[PDB]
């Protein structure tokens, strides 16, 4: 909290709420917007402010979006990492990169929901990191 008030009681917020300019086709989209934003904290200007402190009182701001991202993003990286590794054993690696082998990819895309488990498994004992001595380097 710094130079702010609750959004529900702030006058400048209520001033903007009367003229909300509904976004979607729904007529009440404007009033429905300002209703939910009353929970957040607002400043003198009348717009809401988010606090990414990490306090559980206000976690929907950044913390819940933060967790939802990393589960989605690690899905993409684990899938890409596994699809790239599976191709390397095959003969024609470069063509499969451009012309995707969907038979190999979609089973991998079916997985990835449990990417944190496989990540920890490779970290504890496996292939998450190659040795520095066996990687190309400049002089």
């Amino acid at each position: 909290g710094a130079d702010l008030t609750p959004c529900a009681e702030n006058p400048a917020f209520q001033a903007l709420a009367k003229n909300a300019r509904n976004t979607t086709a729904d007529p009440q989209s404007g009033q429905k917007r300002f209703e939910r934003y009353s929970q957040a904290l607002c400043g003198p200007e009348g717009y809401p402010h988010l606090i990414v402190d990490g306090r559980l009182d206000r976690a929907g701001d950044f913390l819940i979006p933060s967790i939802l991202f990393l589960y989605i993003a690690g899905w993409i990286g684990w899938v890409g990492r596994a699809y790239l590794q599976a191709i390397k054993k095959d003969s024609d690696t470069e063509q499969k990169e451009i012309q995707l082998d969907l038979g190999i990819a979609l089973p991998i895309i079916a997985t990835g929901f449990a990417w944190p488990a496989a990540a920890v498994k490779e970290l504890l004992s496996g292939e998450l990191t190659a040795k520095d001595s066996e990687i190309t380097v400049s002089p």
Binding site: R55, D132, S133, V137, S138
Partner: protein, 39 residues
């Protein structure tokens, strides 16, 4: 080939690295404690 490009000579736990880093981390929580009014 006079000097290797990769260094070696350490063990799994890395006691010296963890000791100083955990100290730096302990200070960070102490600052957070005053901010959250834990102390």
């Amino acid at each position: 080939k006079i000097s290797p490009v990769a260094n070696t000579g350490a063990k799994p736990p890395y006691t010296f690295r963890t000791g100083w880093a955990l100290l730096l981390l302990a200070v960070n929580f102490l600052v957070a404690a005053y901010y959250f009014h834990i102390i």
